[PDB]
């Protein structure tokens, strides 16, 4: 495998891998960072680019993936995709495809123009309808997956599974001193542990010395390094690589 790799640049043609979703004030981070990935991951292995809709993950999977809004599982997420199949859907007030984000966008621990996030929120409905004005109905806009499976936490496989199909979903535990974040290789020296977080998986390389997996994160683009951050790789650092997931889409 390289020494550096990022998906951005070696498949040029799915701008989704480069997309920095705002998961809003919701903790539905464990939905994004699987819708974000199957919409790279459609791009990569079609004989085709769509954005996925965070929408339909987040209020439709129901217990198998958790809880809405108060949190989920990663690999429930997954399996949705290929049980029932996830609609398009972009950014909050986008009207891109057939469920856009009901969450309106905020700041997650930084200042700027958009209202702070709260905490989690409400999860929305479970509405099985596109937007007006588009077209395929529902039932016919859904996109299938064909394999839900874990990575082994081993940074080998992690990289290999990337470099061959594409990002990948992960989780990490988040500590307060996280939070500050805006550039190079994140290592966590204090803070108290904030939550475990869902997030996307898209390269590695080696900064300075400090080999890191490039990470996007869903905090909108005025957080951290125009939204993406690098954590230490290799040591399973904050649980960095101990809940990889991932699937294939079908055709
Ligand atoms: C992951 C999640 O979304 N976690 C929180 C988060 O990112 N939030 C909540 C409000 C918006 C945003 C923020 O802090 O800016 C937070 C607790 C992380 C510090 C979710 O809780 C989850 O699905 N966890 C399970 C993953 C295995």
């Keep these: 495998l390289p020494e550096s790799f990022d998906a951005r640049e070696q498949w040029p043609n799915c701008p989704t891998i480069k997309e920095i979703r705002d998961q809003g004030s919701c903790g539905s981070c464990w939905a994004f ?7 790279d991951r459609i791009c990569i292995h079609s004989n085709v680019n769509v954005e996925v809709s965070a929408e339909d993950m987040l209020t439709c999977c129901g217990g198998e993936c958790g809880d809405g809004c108060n949190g989920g599982e990663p690999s429930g997420a997954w399996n949705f995709w ?3 199949g996830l609609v398009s859907g972009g950014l909050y007030n986008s009207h891109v495809g057939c469920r856009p984000y009901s969450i309106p966008p905020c ?3 930084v200042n700027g123009s958009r209202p702070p996030c709260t905490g989690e929120g409400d ?3 479970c ?9 395929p109905s529902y039932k016919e806009d859904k996109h299938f997956g064909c394999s839900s499976y874990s990575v082994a936490n081993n940074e080998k496989e992690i990289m290999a599974e990337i470099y061959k199909n594409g990002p990948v979903e992960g989780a990490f535990s988040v500590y307060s001193d996280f939070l500050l974040y805006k550039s190079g290789v994140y290592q966590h020296v204090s803070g108290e ?3 475990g977080h869902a997030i996307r998986i898209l390269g590695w390389g080696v900064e300075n010395g400090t080999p890191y997996w490039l990470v996007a994160n869903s905090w909108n683009t005025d957080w951290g390094d125009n939204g993406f951050f690098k954590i230490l790789r290799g040591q399973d650092h904050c649980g960095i690589e101990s809940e990889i997931v991932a ?3 079908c055709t």
């Design 82 to 84: 290929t049980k029932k």
């Design 107 to 109: 700041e997650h621990h």
């Design 127 to 135: 509405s099985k309808t596109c937007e007006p004005g588009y077209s």
């Design 33 to 39: 960072g699987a819708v974000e990935a199957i919409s």
């Design 193 to 195: 542990i904030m939550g």
């Design 247 to 249: 699937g294939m889409p």
């Design 123 to 125: 999860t929305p409905k």
